[PDB]
Amino acid sequence: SSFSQHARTSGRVAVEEVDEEGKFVRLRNKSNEDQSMGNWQIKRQNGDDPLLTYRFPPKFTLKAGQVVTIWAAGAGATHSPPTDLVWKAQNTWGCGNSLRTALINSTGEEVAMRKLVRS
DNA sequence: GCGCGTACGTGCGTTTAAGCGGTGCTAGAGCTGTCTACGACCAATTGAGCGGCCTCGGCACCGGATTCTCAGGCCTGGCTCGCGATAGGGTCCGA
User: A71 and which of A77, A89, A106, A110 could share a cystine (Cβ 3.0–4.6 Å)?
Assistant: First the structure.
């Protein structure tokens, strides 16, 4: 796939899938309990590109075993909570050989991260 | 909680040794008659050994080096980033 994926998780939510073209960001709650992700921050790093910061609404909770996918403006997807959300303020999550998607909670702590590395 | 890859579960054909039966006997477990060395027990011995005192000394306890260990900072090598060269692809042009 030419993009190595590094998965690390210390909480309940893991970064399930990252789009190489930056169309969407997919996270998974692999525990057996619902995770409240109110005002959690998603920071996307594309190599040396400036950070794109996405902020969730003040009250948001992902049910256990459910999938929420954050789509970009250029993707053309339709938001449908609690499973589908679209970030119209950003045309695309970006591209590059070093794509890093870090999930930041409301306390500014990194609990999940997945990095796409291409030789 | 993330992964994996290799070690164990599942399956199944194979056989080969487990299980079944049946035999003979004699090795040895068991039982009975004898008596003979084995052990108990009591009187005296007596001295073996137990019970309180003197010492002295192995050992304990306090003070301060001495060697040790623990902890933290700066320098050098391992490492890496990067420009420009001679080998390979390819061309022809002789006959």
Answer: A77
* Separation of A104 CA and B88 C1' (Å): 52
The reply to whether A7 Cβ lies less than 7 angstroms from strand B is: yes
- Technique used to solve these coordinates: cryo-EM
Return the residue matching tokens 């995770």.
A35
As a rounded value in angstroms, the CA-to-C1' distance for A9 and B74 is 38
Which residue bears the tokens 């970009």?
A72
Does A31 contact strand B, using a CB cutoff of 7 Å?
A: yes
SS3 of chain A: CCCEEEEEECCCEEEEEECCCCCEEEEEECCCCCEECCCCEEEEEECCCCCEEEECCCCCEECCCCEEEEEECCCCCCCECCCEEEECCCCCCCCCCEEEEEEECCCCCEEEEEEEECC
Specify the resolution in Å.
Answer: 7.1
Q: Is any atom of nucleic acid chain B found less than 7 Å from the CB of residue A98?
A: no
